[PDB]
Symmetry: D2
Amino acid sequence: TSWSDRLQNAADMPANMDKHALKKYRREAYHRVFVNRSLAMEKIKCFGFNMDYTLAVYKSPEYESLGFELTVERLVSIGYPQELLSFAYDSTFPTRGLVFDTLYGNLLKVDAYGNLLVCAHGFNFIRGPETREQYPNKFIQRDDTERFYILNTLFNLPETYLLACLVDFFTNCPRYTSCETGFKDGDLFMSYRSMFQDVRDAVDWVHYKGSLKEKTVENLEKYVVKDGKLPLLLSRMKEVGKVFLATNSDYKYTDKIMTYLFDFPHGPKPGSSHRPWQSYFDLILVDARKPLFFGEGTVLRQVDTKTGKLKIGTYTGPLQHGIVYSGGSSDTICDLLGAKGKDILYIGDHIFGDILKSKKRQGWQTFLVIPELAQELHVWTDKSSLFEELQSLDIFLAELSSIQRRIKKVTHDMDMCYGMMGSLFRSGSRQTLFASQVMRYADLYAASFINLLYYPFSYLFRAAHVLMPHES
Amino acid sequence: TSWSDRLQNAADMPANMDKHALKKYRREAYHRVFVNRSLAMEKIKCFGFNMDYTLAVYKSPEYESLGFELTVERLVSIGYPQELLSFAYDSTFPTRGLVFDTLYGNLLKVDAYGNLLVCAHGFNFIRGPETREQYPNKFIQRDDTERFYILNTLFNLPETYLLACLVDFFTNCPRYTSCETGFKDGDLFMSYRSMFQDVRDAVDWVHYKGSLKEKTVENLEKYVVKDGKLPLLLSRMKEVGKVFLATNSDYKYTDKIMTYLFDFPHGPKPGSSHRPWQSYFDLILVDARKPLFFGEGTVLRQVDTKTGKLKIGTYTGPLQHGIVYSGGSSDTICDLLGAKGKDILYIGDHIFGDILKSKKRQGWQTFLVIPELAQELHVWTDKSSLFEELQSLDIFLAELSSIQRRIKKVTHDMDMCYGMMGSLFRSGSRQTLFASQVMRYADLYAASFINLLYYPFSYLFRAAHVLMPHES
Amino acid sequence: TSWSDRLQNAADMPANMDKHALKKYRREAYHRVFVNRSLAMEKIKCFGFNMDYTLAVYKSPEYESLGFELTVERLVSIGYPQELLSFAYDSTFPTRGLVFDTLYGNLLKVDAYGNLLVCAHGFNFIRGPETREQYPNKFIQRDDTERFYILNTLFNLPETYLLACLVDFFTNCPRYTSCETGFKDGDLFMSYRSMFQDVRDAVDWVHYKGSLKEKTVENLEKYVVKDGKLPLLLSRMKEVGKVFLATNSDYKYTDKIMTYLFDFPHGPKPGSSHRPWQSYFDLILVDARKPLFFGEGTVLRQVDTKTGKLKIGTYTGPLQHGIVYSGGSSDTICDLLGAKGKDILYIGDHIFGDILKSKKRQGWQTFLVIPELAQELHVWTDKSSLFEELQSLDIFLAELSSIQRRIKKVTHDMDMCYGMMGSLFRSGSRQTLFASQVMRYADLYAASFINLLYYPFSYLFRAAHVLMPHES
Amino acid sequence: TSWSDRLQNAADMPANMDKHALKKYRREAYHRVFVNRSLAMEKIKCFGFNMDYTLAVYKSPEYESLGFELTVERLVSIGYPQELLSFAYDSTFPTRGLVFDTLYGNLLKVDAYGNLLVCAHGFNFIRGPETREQYPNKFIQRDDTERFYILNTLFNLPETYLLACLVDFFTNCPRYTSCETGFKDGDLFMSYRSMFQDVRDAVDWVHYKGSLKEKTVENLEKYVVKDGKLPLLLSRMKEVGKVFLATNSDYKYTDKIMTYLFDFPHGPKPGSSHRPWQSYFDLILVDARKPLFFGEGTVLRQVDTKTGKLKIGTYTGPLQHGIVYSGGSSDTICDLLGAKGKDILYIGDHIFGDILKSKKRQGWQTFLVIPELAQELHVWTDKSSLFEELQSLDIFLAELSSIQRRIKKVTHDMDMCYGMMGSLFRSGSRQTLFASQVMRYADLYAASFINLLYYPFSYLFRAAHVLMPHES
Ligand SMILES: Nc1ncnc2c1ncn2[C@H]1C[C@H](O)[C@@H](COP(=O)(O)OP(=O)(O)OP(=O)(O)O)O1
Ligand SMILES: Nc1ncnc2c1ncn2[C@H]1C[C@H](O)[C@@H](COP(=O)(O)OP(=O)(O)OP(=O)(O)O)O1
Ligand SMILES: Nc1ncnc2c1ncn2[C@H]1C[C@H](O)[C@@H](COP(=O)(O)OP(=O)(O)OP(=O)(O)O)O1
Ligand SMILES: Nc1ncnc2c1ncn2[C@H]1C[C@H](O)[C@@H](COP(=O)(O)OP(=O)(O)OP(=O)(O)O)O1
Ligand SMILES: [Mg+2]
Ligand SMILES: [Mg+2]
Ligand SMILES: [Mg+2]
Ligand SMILES: [Mg+2]
């Protein structure tokens, strides 16, 4: 059972909009919206979306596996060894939000301070004492962006696994000699940095020049979660405010995917006339180039929706019915919709490019979709005895080293329930960078934005006020 | 009763080192060390200090008043109007950590997200509706460092007040015409940005070229808190680890101030031989240039301690007894003391330059001194009925607008107990940027670092583990 | 008769290597090497080449016309209007080295100081008085690289003409309104800057992603000058020094073009065995990325010459027989050939990327190929009575305004003999930027590098010493 | 006889303004204006000046010696060794325009291409073969501004000599060990780069914080050339155009120096009323900050001429009688005087900051003052047999190595007639960087701007037109 199996199972159920049923449903963690800061929904005047991994949630592990295969094939076609063709995607290895250290070729799971929680070199998980040669303070400067790359999105899952596959391969293939910063093959030296760059380039290439989009659109039922409740929720949002789309994808791809998401023999409700996906938006903007979108952005262009090409010139006109925009900036949305930032709830899956940036640069209110939560919540509840034991052990230890061996063991067994790289949100009792960023920048979060359907228009989402230690 | 009166009253008391007395003393909030993240003191191998406003806590409001007067005098001497000489420092106006908006000439108190909590134009406190012309989303991009200046340190208190004095003066003096971004005096236009720069330049000048240091050292009892417990605590630290000083000040000034701080007719304890201040440090580093110190730093130099001048050349030698360093980097400390970052507890008063930077760049453990806490804690406890009422009102309102007028009123009355700009840490129920940064980057904090004297060597400082909303 | 007709006519003649015949031949300006600074050929130890427009001189106007057509087709395919398909390349319009002003949409011919010599808006040549609204000092800041683009190479001839075609089109098409900085088409505004960028992007696209290379290689006799004397001269160079190729082109294309250039039923001389083109080089380097090549360059890679793909990794080995390099830096050449800069004669056609940069950054000796000289020399000699009249008029005027109308007229008639944009090297008595840069950075220059064949190994190229006015 | 002795001897002579006398006088090279590009004086509408070393020509070697002494004293006061006090300025060592190589501690005299003409390490002049270890291609990348510093102005003569003194001292003092990039003194390493920076800082300090200005103004007759013909020429300029001053110096110093320059018991002519120096200018601008002045510049300020302080605010008014400006940009001059660049003749002594920048950035016409020419012209004429022999030897050698030993010897004997670093303009037959820059950027040049007095208002300065080798 993947997290997308969980999402599609809930997608298959029609909405029971009876008030009491809705209240009952949203008690379950799976259908809940979680609250980091209080938010009065009555004050939201605009609902903003992105498409990829928010409206269009790609099925797992099929879509990751497709991306992986195509990226591998691209590396082989540019000269990587034939053995890469024996690799096969393994969904049990990667967790999202890991950091690739391009100097030493390690995948690192870190906390908000850059402290090391896990370190894997290829598939070798390096124990604490042995990480000290390379990380003498068990720490990285995680904003040293020339050295460290943060794998934030679900699109980064294939490369997360591939990086580990490649380090493992070169390490164990006697044609190469392993060095601290890369591999020697006679008079050729491949640094981990250059290897990483090749992987990144190949992933970009697969998406923008290769066959990934074409292979996705030829089998949308295999690759994309589909939910009759989507048009219902968007139609309801439009009854109380404005609705917009700001996507990094292009118009041709957006139109294919969105047409699929709205392809039912009805509109918002069974029995209602089907309506084109575009009719659900007051403003549609493609090629957004987030995160630059939230600063200077790019020139505002108009899409010719017949051809899918941009009209020539910068668009200087007003918001009009049927127009589709390309590029621009977050100021375009505000200006054209007559909104200030706090009037907007932006619904994103990219912790950096959607959530952190809209919050910090523009003061937008935020909703983070975290698809893996659909399955992490099941693990959390099913294995809760392990976390609770860990908690008791931490308490007992603090109440002034056999206990320390036990803490490592329980931490490991708990973490393995999630995958080889553990929970998205923690390793044992230590929170991840990703968890910290979710708490700090996402006002609301959930396994799916669909969970807003279970709360009324006027709902006041509440979080407890925070007190400093000296105020308690 | 200023916060420095509180600190000096506690300074005047000799240490009662009986175990039970120490435990009893540190129960009181005034003598407590507060904990944001757990910290095992047994693991600290080095104790690091800065001097200004940490070891040498300048008395208030005398020292602020001196800085203010000298800065005013410098502005007049470069051509500002004679009316400035009628200004007098008012300690009830400024709170630390405000942001000066150089575009519109406002002092702003903001939360961690850049939301406006207070906005004052000169001495006019601008109500919420009226801030909307200049701040349509009641928000600033607080990292837009070309526009906004964050007044982080106690050295910034005089300029905080002076900026407000100047805006008030020019606004109400009929020689000038008030414009959105500055003042017109015939064919001269003074922007708030250029005014701010003149103030900043004059404060720097007073410190580095003018008479502030000379006037301070000629009356140290008036200007600097002095505590017989200082040598005691430093001597105890040196029994269990290494002790270092990294100060932005120069050696001549450092030697004058430190000699004063250690000028008692005894050493660590009454009855013990007096020892020179330098004997309390394994490493002494001046001209540190924090925050650059925590990145590339500057060339390591050696001070000639006879002359107070730098020896010519970069110092390439080892740590030796009696040597004093100048410049260098945080790596100098680690290398020469044989320490890794987590072995170090750095004791600072500069939330940005000492605490945030050492934590984020180097993974040092941190202790933030907050001198104002010595008096804010008294207000917090004495006026607790007001905060508690505010809390109940927030609860009652949330449990689904006469109440909203009451929330504004109680928020205002509470805030005024601290000063015209409120508590360092909050406005009503909203936490400040400074509070957020204290919680995020300072592992420990207190009104004085002296409060470490009341905890044993082995102490385990404990903070509760943090859970995400979906983990609760 | 195009300049390439002249070059191919001389190419068709076999070499008569008799000493007296060679001396006689090199007296004619067409077969001469011209000298800006003295150069002792005996001191040259390495001869360096580029390929495009040096070894491989594309035929004119056929190749320009092909580039033009394909660029037009690309613009139409991305949404430019269908009328562009009626454009046809006109070799009589563009001269090389013009500056496009992206603010006002003008092609400018300037001197070394940025003084305006010609200004054309579309096909409207703007008289002096009328240029003053846009250029009040008849001057541009020609290093303001964000505004001005210098069209240095023969590859830039199609876009030179196309830019003028586009400004003319939009100006005269009543669908658009002409503004100072671009064109309005309803709610779309196309700046001259964005138009320019589209043209530049389309030219790049045609070369790197489109069909230009494929169409060139399918008819090499139509598109590329071929000369049996090439292998002869390169073989002679190799008898007295080392020979290298540093080309911005890729290996696959290089191999196709070079194989064509050496495809004769003989090697260096008639009667000799044919040898592969690679055998004529001690070092072959592709993907050079000049001008970056002459600074930091890029990582040194090795080409797999079977596949045409790069081997994975940086190449750390020595110079070996049969190896082909990719990327690297000018230091690669020096290190691997055991050369210092003054030992190298680099033979280039790019005044900036080959000549100025190798001279200024590395102190290489330089030879500039200027293919248009093959026809400009004919005009210069045939119309010499016009220049001589201009000279006499300048003299007579200086010897203290009917004469000034005559100077404009004669200047215009002279310039028109070269084309609508005049000589590469001057407008009337004023030298162009290009001329100045040739004199300043090219030690030697000629219509073809083949002209070195007519000078012996030991030749001392001589230029007169320069004296300052006060030294004369 | 120094160059300033020559200038003051000519200064002492009253002007004979008879037409025939003026024509006769300007035939002599000493009183001539030299012409790099033709310039019609009738077209000049504004005459612009700088003060230091143009209007105010400091006497030599007295002023250099003063600067040297004060700089030495400053270095000793910050910790340099006492032996520096034994140094004494030697005017026979430095020539202007040398390059200090901060890596290897050499003074270099280079041509326009960065080729080495002379290399001195301290006072050791390094022969050609021995320069090859450090400069393998006898070349530097002279725009590598982090490594190389170009000593352009007469203010740089003291530091030119001091740098050589210091390298010599440390090299020969057995307390220090000489290394490739600096000197070791036990555990202190002084790089040539840090030494250079100390010298540069000390020269700045002497000028802006120390006693140089005060010592100059207390003995102006010792330190500043004074000429009754100055007011005459400026008065004549004002009869036919506008006159402005743009100086990097401050108003207080400018007023002292200018008052001295105009302190005669007459105005322009004997018998005429004395007039204040300010009356000779339509526009007076101080604190110009050239070269930044010719780009963005700084905020335009107004000087209070009573106090010498800046009025507070940016000056937004028109040009008015008696106003004095500070900061601004070259656009300030043009706007306020109603001039375009080619209407302006700017008279400067700084080849980079006055001449190159005004020409290249703004298209101003230029006049370079070169005070040393007043004595170099005497050497040039007196030792002309040596240059002529060198010329004949170059000719004879070229007409196909005993001759090469003779060329080195004659080159050396010629160069020594100018000083140990040779002529400003050449070493033997090779022109210097400075010479090249004079020819390229200075339209006119002379030993003094006073030489304009000897040419009528309408004069047409003529230079021969330049032809390319293929045009001859
Ligand atoms: N999730 C992320 N992915 C990629 N880059 C990130 C991410 N979070 C932060 N950064 C980058 C942007 C900045 O260059 C740098 C500063 O990060 P840091 O200050 O440590 O984190 P933060 O949570 O305070 O966010 P911010 O970066 O916006 O300040 O790190
Ligand atoms: N207290 C402060 N004083 C001055 N500048 C600050 C302060 N805090 C942050 N900055 C600056 C440094 C960066 O340019 C920018 C980024 O800040 P921001 O990311 O919002 O805060 P933060 O608490 O995440 O710290 P950081 O700046 O280190 O990421 O703001
Ligand atoms: N032919 C050219 N093509 C493109 N850019 C040029 C060319 N010549 C010079 N530049 C650019 C590089 C620099 O940014 C800037 C400085 O030019 P400038 O100093 O005026 O010319 P130059 O002949 O002295 O060469 P250089 O640029 O190398 O100094 O202009
Ligand atoms: N006389 C000088 N003094 C200081 N810097 C100089 C001087 N001449 C040139 N430069 C600097 C400015 C640029 O960074 C760099 C480029 O110089 P270069 O192109 O070789 O000389 P140039 O005579 O063509 O002038 P420019 O620098 O303006 O292009 O060198
Ligand atoms: Mg997305
Ligand atoms: Mg401090
Ligand atoms: Mg080429
Ligand atoms: Mg000057």
